[PDB]
Design a protein around this ligand. Structure first.
Ligand SMILES: Nc1ncnc2c1ncn2[C@@H]1O[C@H](COP(=O)(O)OP(=O)(O)O)[C@@H](O)[C@H]1O
Ligand SMILES: Nc1ncnc2c1ncn2[C@@H]1O[C@H](COP(=O)(O)OP(=O)(O)O)[C@@H](O)[C@H]1O
Ligand SMILES: [Mg+2]
Ligand SMILES: [Mg+2]
Ligand SMILES: [Mg+2]
Ligand SMILES: [Mg+2]
Lengths: 319, 312
């Protein structure tokens, strides 16, 4: 058995991806090789991939896509790329054409879960509660269906990149410009405040099993990039201090969304809890995978050790 | 400016894909090379691609995927593949990773328009009419809230494969079994009967322009009847406009790029959007091209616009 782990990527989450790879590479219970996609899109293989991992960032790569990799040597490919060109169905599509089994969601589910506009449309249709929002296209005059404050974001982003809180309409233009640096489509959501952030892990193909629910607490105005990756800045409460009904509703909604979207392998489902009301914020098909990341910790609290979690992910990819 | 046209594919529409390629090569106003995906998945390049084209069918290819193709020699790629591994976002993903501009819908829009379950969920939430349906997952017995007749279909196999018209609930189990041999998810749609089928073309990136509306009609069988692409469709004034407006709304909501042939059902005065084809048939006599020609957009000009849109 041999697994190919791909990390890095051209998205803003390149460094976060390499961090996830470090954690996975240390506990994955299978012979595994690492391939790195540099920020310039060129791949780094073998020892150069390991050298990049140790550097924590690979600006330049050697091989133009597609890389001269002996794909036949791998039983499963574990795409550990976060964000566009990795978690959005693009890499998945390549793997489908290659006929290679891989970890995580397929093309449709990956593309849909990454889009903060379309995912909300599908979930709402299924009766899942979501935050009021509207999509805005670059070059299209914005007409927000509700008053501020808002959270403006690239429709496809991660690690809070390109996201900002907007208090007045006159500040919307600049917030959208920032979002458009990352995507041609942005979303403007009604800002919930105060808000509690709950996250739950799901494991399995389509019909999943839920981990305990966790909660994120911090002092910053919102769960931004520095708060997300600065160890100890955020507080992860596992399990989250929720009453039984709310805990169960979070887990049930997560499994429902997971099934409707047809997610395979895994997903960390994040929610907002405000004034006793729950909202499914987003599903993450390739959640941060450091041993300390939320998804791994969640399942650890659920009796599934890090090595065992990775084993199951690989096995699910083969069924 | 040099364009790369990819046609053929491993789907059942391999032959029609080559016919579309033939039509495109004949009128595309840019230097263009052809690459063919044989029915076995291997690629044929250079002269062998042209040989396959003239043969109208390429059973076996030479190069296993990914092919040793000089991508840098092309400014735009035109994936003229239909169905599975063509309109589902897979080839689009490969082209995205290659960093090559390409004609038509991107990964998300392609994958979504392909899925007869998810596309309906999106459209229904946006207020676009679609027929009543239920999504069914392999291994999980379905609960259909409406009565037969039904049209059971794999959710993402495409190419009319595995689609059955069911008239009795007792025949549902079998119909589903058939659909599930092609996809892990199927849909059970309320069958409209009688029903008329209308089609309209859209061109542009996200904010498109609609062509006139056409109707797919069949003539009486003799010793089944032929199918005419009647342009324009004989409809009341408001109806044509509604068809165009719904097509443009669906197009924008799904974020489609380049083009789409949007197919509708008309029954008892009610419209239902059945499908957005992101890579429609493209021969000189195909519905999409003829619709825009009726709209004042000549075939060569249509091809030019699709190539230019791919760059913006
Ligand atoms: N509608 C909202 N109301 C309140 N806070 C929000 C809202 N949307 C986003 N946020 C804040 O921004 C953070 C990131 O938003 P998110 O959509 O999860 O982007 P990302 O996919 O990068 O994690 C959230 O964890 C939350 O703290
Ligand atoms: N809900 C329905 N009611 C009536 N006829 C239908 C329905 N769904 C499909 N059909 C018939 O089957 C044909 C193909 O349906 P479609 O889903 O578009 O298959 P394909 O994926 O091959 O294009 C339609 O053109 C129509 O004649
Ligand atoms: Mg996310
Ligand atoms: Mg988040
Ligand atoms: Mg189709
Ligand atoms: Mg159709």
């Amino acid at each position: 058995m041999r697994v190919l782990l791909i990390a890095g990527g051209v998205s803003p989450e390149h460094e976060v991806s390499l961090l996830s790879a470090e954690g996975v590479l240390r506990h994955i219970p299978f012979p595994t090789d690492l391939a790195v996609i540099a920020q310039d899109g060129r791949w780094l293989l073998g020892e150069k991939a390991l050298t990049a991992l140790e550097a924590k960032a690979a600006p330049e790569g050697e091989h133009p896509f597609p890389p001269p990799l002996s794909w036949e040597r791998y039983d499963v490919v574990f795409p550990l790329l976060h964000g566009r060109f990795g978690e959005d169905g693009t890499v998945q599509g390549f793997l489908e054409l290659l006929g290679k089994p891989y970890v995580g969601a397929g093309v449709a589910a990956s593309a849909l879960c990454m889009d903060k506009d379309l995912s909300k449309r599908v979930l709402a249709q299924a009766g899942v509660p979501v935050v009021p929002w509207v999509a805005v296209r670059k070059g299209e005059p914005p007409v927000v269906p509700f008053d501020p404050p808002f959270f403006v974001k690239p429709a496809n982003t991660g690690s809070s990149v390109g996201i900002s809180r907007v208090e007045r309409f006159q500040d919307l233009e600049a917030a959208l410009a920032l979002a458009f640096r990352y995507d041609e489509k942005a979303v403007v959501e009604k800002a919930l405040s105060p808000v509690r952030e709950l996250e739950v892990g799901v494991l399995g193909n389509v019909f999943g099993e839920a981990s305990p629910v966790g909660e994120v607490r911090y002092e910053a105005p919102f769960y931004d990039y520095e708060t997300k990756y600065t160890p100890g800045r955020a507080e992860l409460l596992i399990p989250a201090p929720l009453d039984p009904g709310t805990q169960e509703t979070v887990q049930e909604l997560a499994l429902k969304a997971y099934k409707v979207l047809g997610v395979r392998g895994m997903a960390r489902v994040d929610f907002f809890l405000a004034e006793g009301e729950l909202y499914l914020n987003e599903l993450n098909t390739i959640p941060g995978f450091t041993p300390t990341s939320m998804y791994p910790r969640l399942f650890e609290a659920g009796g599934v050790a890090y090595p065992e979690l990775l084993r199951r992910l690989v096995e699910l990819a083969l069924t």
